[PDB]
Amino acid sequence: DNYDGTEKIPDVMPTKIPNLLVNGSSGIAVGMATNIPPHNLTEVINGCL
DNA sequence: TTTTTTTTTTTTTTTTTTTTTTTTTTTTTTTTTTTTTTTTTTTTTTTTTTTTTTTTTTTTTTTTTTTTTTTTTTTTTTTTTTTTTTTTTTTTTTTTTTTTTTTTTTTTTTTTTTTTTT
After folding, report:
1. Which nucleotide is nearest to A33 (CA to C1')?
2. Suppose A24 and one of A10, A14, A20, A38 were both cysteines; which one would form an S-S bond, judging by CB atoms 3.0 to 4.6 Å apart?
3. Quick one: signal sequence residues?
């Protein structure tokens, strides 16, 4: 449920694409900090297979 | 195949101008110091009956020096003109209202790289 409690939000998307490796990410947390480069979708799917 | 003319951007560094850091003078601003106002009470001042011996005004008459007085000639007063100040129509500029068009900034958090100082 959302902040008001009047509507629902997904906890996680049911992805088919490996979005983390594919599109990458970059963010600055208080203690941690992530920096993940993008990747090619065909190569990542071959690795998954 | 060798040799000859011309064209411009650079070795440029110096003159002129512009931009950017500076600090004397009249207009603000916080402080201390002197003018205003309200209570207590307090000896002290001040309002009001009675008696009293006083000292200045009103019977009457006197004069003299200020009140009569006329007249010459000044000189303040009034007239016109022009300048200086005051005051009010006129104009200009700016601000606010509510729907529109556009934009612009300050910080956390981590991790890695430049970019100065020691």
Report:
1. B110
2. A38
3. none
E-strand ranges in chain A read 25-28, 33-36
Structure tokens at A2: 């959302």
Task: Calculate the angstrom distance between C1' of B29 and CA of A22.
Answer: 67
The structure was resolved to a resolution in Å of: 3.0
B/e letters for A30-48, b = 16+ CB within 10 Å, e = fewer, are eeeeeeeeeeeeeebeeee
Query: Which contacts (CB < 8 Å, 24+ apart) does range A37-45 have?
Result: A41/A17, A44/A18, A45/A18
